[PDB]
Amino acid sequence: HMLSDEQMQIINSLVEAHHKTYDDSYSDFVRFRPPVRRLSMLPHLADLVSYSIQKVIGFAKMIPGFRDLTAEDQIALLKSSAIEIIMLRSNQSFSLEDMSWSCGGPDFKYCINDVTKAGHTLELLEPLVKFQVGLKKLKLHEEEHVLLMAICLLSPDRPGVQDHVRIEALQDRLCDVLQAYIRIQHPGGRLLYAKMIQKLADLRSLNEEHSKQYRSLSFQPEHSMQLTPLVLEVFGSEVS
Template sequence: MRPEESWSHVGLVQRKEADSVSNKSINTDEEDGGLQICRVCGDKANGYHFNVMTCEGCKGFFRRAMKRNVRLRCPFRKGTCEITRKTRRQCQACRLRKCLESGMKKEMIMSDAAVEQRRALIKRKRREKTEVPAPGGQGLTEEQQALIQELMDAQMKTFDTTFSHFKDFRLRGEDGSIWNYQPPSKSDGKEIIPLLPHLADVSTYMFKGVINFAKVISYFRDLPIEDQISLLKGATFEMCILRFNTMFDTETGTWECGRLAYCFEDPDGGFQKLLLDPMMKLHCMLKKLQLHKEEYVLMQAISLFSPDRPGVVQRGVVDQLQERFALTLKAYIECSRPYPAHRFLFLKIMAVLTELRSINVQQTQQLLRIQDTHPFATPLMQELLSSTDG
């Protein structure tokens, strides 16, 4: 750092010396780590300015004198006036001479523009260190705030977290029969195959909520109906997983769905290894991020507006929309999360979305195999399974 405009970290104490002091006393005081005084007038110094330890007054005088570029004359015609705190205003010529003799350098004076720029930079850095932005507002553009609000409203209207309207459960037996079924409060891996039809109903209930979520979003409604269908076929599973994660308890490994709870344990390892393990790892990884509700809905939007889904025609439009949601997520994190603890959160979320895409393909393949031997899927679920990526 250049010394001319900086402040030294020196303890300032009350001045006790006389106004006029010798160079010897100045050097002794500084070497002893005591009072720091101006090399020009002997006043209390506040830092190095233009290469010399000076007071604020001599700093300003030297800058003004050098910028005026006027030849000064000693009014007493001596040229050797003693410069002290009390006499420094009496002779500008001798004061300037003392400044130069002390080692102050004209070439170290910053321009007015550079000084203002430096001050603004210092203020900004101080503000960044001390201010803690309020979540979800400061730092976001009006458009981004409106976008998040629209997503939050859509989520609230379409996500029944209590499952209060999920009342009729169906269980399909191997003989094709269907009957009403009230599932146990908790389900483990031993019952997983018989429970698949019920889990299909649970999933279908969530699918309908996700589809309604998409239809509420104005950006989605503006797309051609063909692209709407293609995007939903590709993203519905992924968006449901994101919603299910909000109800997942990592300590118990349980999904709390209103009055129902699901805790899958498969001691035989077969079904769990194929279907549950990757899903459990994803849910645990995602839950560790401790996401805000705003971040969950933005993730759903990023997943929904994926331009590379099969059948999408207006890929350029969808790509721009996905970028808008991604930039909004990044901006939200930056203005609502403390730095640097969450500086990599955006990258972690994008990595989770990539992993989610991969698991979606793997799960679809596994469920199709199970569907061949143990039919369980609802018509909506069959349509989604038959058209997911992969």
């Protein structure tokens, strides 16, 4: 009926870690290769994703216990989940009014058509945008948003993980926190927890579709040469 002292600590450090790795001013975006509207948007969006992967690694390293995993498991979890955390964290710039991601300036406003010009089809972009509006309607508390990112990252059902028992226990503790938080602190959220777990399921499907479309891009060197070294390493298929 009331959040434990250790549960709120988990929340505090997750919230701080998110504020430390998500810049609401988006001022860093000017450093990316500019947008062009072939695949005219592939250079800017590749820089956007690469920058975001660095943020997700920074967030991950501040989840309680993630750092104490082996370096192999840390990589396994990041390589499988990175695109999912990006889709999740991007909800913070998504707008229902424009059905797009608005990152400050109009040059950093990304329509669906912008993403197609980066090598992606409606097969991915249709369910991605539906995922964003539905996640947006949930009206998540900041505490809930960050817990969902952390739960998604700490999934033991990823290819490559070895310490299944440890990762599951971490993820369990995070779900208990989320469930308690919603119960105590979110009025009218008796159905929210289930809805959020459903969004995790949607992310697996978006991940699958993104992986398929990334694969075709990376098999064409005139496109893959536009990617960054971090993108190719993280979304690549090498195994540690």
